[PDB]
Design a protein around this ligand. Structure first.
Ligand SMILES: C[C@@]1(N2C(=O)c3ccc(C(=O)O)cc3C2=O)CCC(=O)NC1=O
Lengths: 176, 232
């Protein structure tokens, strides 16, 4: 039950905080609240996250386009999720990389800028789940489906990790 | 928009303030650092006050855009090349994985020919270069600027792990005349920087032609480009 927070290297005014929960019962109520804006942060499918680096790269590109006003989506917390998809289909990206009604483990990512902080004790209070530390993230992540949803290769694993092949389509999809 | 963009290029400059400069060219500066806990290298294509900021704008963008798709194309193809972490199109910076502890092929060849004293020792390296550029060209990806300093040797050195870098002038084409001209500039790169390494360029060429299935027409157009001096 410990957070993992990292400071954005190009925007050191910002920080990124990761909270992971197991045995969630109200994932459906949780999703409606994200579309409704009640809850703060991005609710992400942890099944397809191989390393916090995947989250930070997405966080970084989201703040960057947020601060330039040229985000491809609406909220910052929704641009984070989208930047995890290997395609540019916004609606497909947020079903497959968000959380869905019958999920039991969810990952919450939120960015605070400078002094403005998030009420992290009100945020956990909304999840009917057991907050576990992100060290537990490997035993939730499923490679069989990381490979499916990222379409990783024969050849791609031969020249590096699968995190590298993922990062390297996240970061170039805006140029086809 | 006009004000916010000045800010985004202003973080850029600040970020690179405290980084070690590792490569400098007419178009690009390359700084060494760390990016979210990973060993990274950042390639800035800086503007020069010398020309119209309208033309210079697109020149940075194209090189960066073209390098970004080229490194994606090589990762999905088993062609080893740096991973790209982030691409800032406001500043034309390119955040990519550092190839730690590597040495260029150019210094692997004026280091092996000052101790071995003969090019007879370089045919394994030539063999592997033929294999690397064959599978690159076999996906119709033209490098655009092949030299022995845009190929790195990842440790351990003994196994000759070639990493290609610097794809700003790269482009897609299945034309053998384009693959032919791509090998010609590497040939002239050997000639200018590495004297008496001519025997090394077919251990390459013979390797290339047994490793790429469409190499016969490319070596007819290489010998036609060598006769002309250019493509036409
Ligand atoms: C010096 C070195 N390095 C890169 O990794 C690299 C990546 C891309 C480029 C490029 O031009 O696209 C250049 C370079 C470059 O020079 C290699 C040795 C080392 O240990 N660390 C480095 O940073």
């Amino acid at each position: 039950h410990m957070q993992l927070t990292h400071q954005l290297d190009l925007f050191p005014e910002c920080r990124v905080t990761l909270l992971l929960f197991k045995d969630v019962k109200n994932a459906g109520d949780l999703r409606r609240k994200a579309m409704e804006g009640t809850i703060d942060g991005s609710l992400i499918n942890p099944t397809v996250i191989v390393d916090p680096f995947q989250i930070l790269v997405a966080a970084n590109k989201a703040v960057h386009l947020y601060k330039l006003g040229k985000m491809k989506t609406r909220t910052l917390s929704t641009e984070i999720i989208f930047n995890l998809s290997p395609n540019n289909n916004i609606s497909e990206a947020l079903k497959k990389f968000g959380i869905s009604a019958n999920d039991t483990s969810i990952l919450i990512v939120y960015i605070e800028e400078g002094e403005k902080q998030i009420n992290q004790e009100y945020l956990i209070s909304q999840v009917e789940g057991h907050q576990v530390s992100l060290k537990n993230l490997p035993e939730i992540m499923n490679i069989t489906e990381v490979k499916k949803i990222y379409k990783l290769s024969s050849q791609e694993e031969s020249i590096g990790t699968l995190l590298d092949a993922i990062i390297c389509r996240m970061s170039t999809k805006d140029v086809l | 928009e006009a004000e916010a963009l000045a800010a985004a290029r202003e973080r850029s400059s600040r970020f690179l303030s405290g980084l070690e400069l590792v490569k400098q060219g007419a178009e690009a500066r390359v700084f060494r650092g760390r990016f979210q806990g990973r060993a990274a290298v950042i390639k800035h294509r800086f503007p020069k006050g010398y020309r119209h900021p309208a033309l210079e704008a697109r020149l940075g963008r194209r090189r960066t855009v073209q390098e970004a798709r080229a490194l994606l194309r090589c990762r999905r193809a088993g062609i080893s090349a740096p991973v790209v972490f982030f691409v800032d199109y406001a500043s034309n910076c390119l955040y990519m994985e550092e190839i730690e502890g590597s040495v260029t092929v150019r210094d692997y060849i004026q280091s092996t020919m000052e101790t071995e004293k003969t090019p007879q020792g370089l045919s394994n390296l030539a063999k592997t270069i033929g294999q690397v550029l064959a599978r690159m060209h076999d996906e119709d990806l033209i490098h655009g600027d092949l030299t022995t300093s845009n190929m790195l040797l990842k440790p351990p050195l003994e196994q000759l792990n070639i990493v290609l870098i610097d794809f700003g002038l790269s482009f897609i084409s299945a034309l053998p005349e384009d693959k032919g001209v791509d090998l010609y500039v590497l040939e002239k790169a050997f000639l200018s920087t590495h004297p008496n390494t001519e025997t090394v360029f077919e251990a390459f060429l013979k390797s290339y032609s047994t490793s790429s299935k469409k190499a016969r027409p490319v070596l007819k157009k290489l010998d036609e480009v060598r006769l002309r001096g250019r493509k036409r």
